[PDB]
Design a protein around this ligand. Structure first.
Ligand SMILES: [Zn+2]
Lengths: 82, 48, 48, 98
DNA sequence: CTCAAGTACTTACGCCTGGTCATT
RNA sequence: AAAGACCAGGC
């Protein structure tokens, strides 16, 4: 659907958080450029977590509605549970 | 005997906690309910 | 997709060797799967 | 008396010689670890049993419990990637392998 | 032709360890 | 040795 009239929870579900963190960690571990600055962080998982806390993950979540439509939420647009 | 600032903080906490309690879309509720039903059956006696 | 006359077996499928694996007997002999034995019986009676 | 600090234990302990028997069940004969070992001839899946270096079974109840977690790709790994992975070439017109 | 009252299928926890035996 | 059956046993 369009950017207007979006109806889902603005909160990001724990499943979305888990999958986006896993995907971002895999990308980081596969030489993708990091978004947040890293202070001696060699572990991609903590790097992805720090990126999430800074809302800098370059991923948009496509939330499929049961009727076949979908809605695109950037991780920055979604507000972190933690 | 709450104060005004305390009342505002309480309203904020109520809103935040209620929004946290909302079921997350994507949650597998069917399997969760089936397991939450079958688990007590293990501890239930076969005799009446 | 499915016609009535296709439900009468006139051409019998023969599953590949993966479905009915043969077991190497120390390289000297080769035993056969139960499916292979049933296939042998079917081919014998069909030729007869 | 406490073995470490030497202080008297406040409670008085019940001590006496009691007959104890060692059992056949011992950890050295029960511990098992699997990491990409032998596979079954038919299913091309990890073998059965400790002696054959077989893998542990991720039963139906296991996948139901993981579904309750909503752990989709952990389940995919457990049932597709950790166990037998495979690729097939299937036609586009017919849905049958080619 | 068409309704209730007899005859067929189909299934009964989760793994885990091992030892023995007949065919192959 | 292969899968099949049986048996005994642990939680
Ligand atoms: Zn085709």
């Amino acid at each position: 659907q369009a950017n207007q009239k979006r109806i889902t929870t603005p909160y990001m579900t724990k499943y979305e958080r888990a999958r986006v963190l896993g995907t971002r960690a895999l990308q980081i571990a596969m030489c993708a450029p990091v978004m947040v600055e890293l202070e001696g962080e060699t572990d991609p998982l903590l790097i992805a977590m720090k990126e999430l806390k800074a809302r800098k993950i370059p991923i948009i979540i496509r939330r499929y509605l049961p009727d076949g439509s979908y809605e695109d939420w950037g991780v920055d647009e979604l507000i972190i549970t933690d | 005997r709450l104060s005004g600032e305390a009342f505002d903080w309480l309203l904020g906490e109520i809103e935040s906690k209620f929004n946290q309690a909302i079921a997350h879309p994507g949650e597998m509720v069917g399997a969760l309910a089936a397991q939450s039903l079958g688990e007590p059956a293990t501890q239930m006696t076969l005799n009446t | 997709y499915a016609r009535p006359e296709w439900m009468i077996v006139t051409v019998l499928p023969v599953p590949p060797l993966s479905v009915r694996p043969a077991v190497v007997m120390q390289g000297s002999a080769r035993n056969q799967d139960d499916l292979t034995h049933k296939l042998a019986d079917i081919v014998k009676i069909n030729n007869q | 008396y406490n073995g470490f600090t030497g202080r008297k234990i406040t409670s008085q302990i019940f001590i006496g010689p009691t007959y104890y028997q060692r059992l056949k069940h011992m950890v050295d004969d029960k511990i098992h670890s699997r990491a990409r070992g032998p596979i079954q001839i038919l299913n091309r899946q990890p073998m059965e049993g400790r002696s054959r270096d077989g893998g542990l079974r991720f039963g139906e109840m296991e996948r139901d419990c993981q579904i309750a977690h909503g752990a989709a790709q952990f389940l995919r790994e457990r049932l597709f990637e950790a166990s037998d992975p495979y690729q097939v070439h299937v036609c586009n017109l017919c849905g049958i392998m080619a």
